[PDB]
């Protein structure tokens, strides 16, 4: 699978700027 390894970092790079507020 690539969704849980290739794009699994898309959340750590995105959510990192979204959760930085909450």
Protein model, in words:
The chain starts with 9 loop residues before the first helix and ends with a helix. The chain has 1 helix and no strands. The protein is mainly α. It is 41% helix and 0% strand. It is rod-shaped and about 30 Å long. Residues 10-21 are annotated as: Interaction with SARS-CoV spike glycoprotein.
What's the topology here?
Layout: H1 10-18
What is the H/E string?
A: H
The N- to C-terminal Cα distance equals: 31 Å
The share of residues in helices is: 40-55%
The share of residues in extended strands comes to under 5%
Oligomeric state? monomer
Number of helices: 1
Biggest sheet features: none
Structural class: mainly alpha
Relevant terms:
22 residues, mainly alpha, Angiotensin-converting enzyme 2
Quick summary:
The protein is an all-alpha fold. It is built from one helix and no strands.
């Amino acid at each position: 699978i690539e969704e849980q390894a290739k794009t699994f970092l898309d959340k750590f790079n995105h959510e990192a700027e979204d959760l930085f507020y909450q």
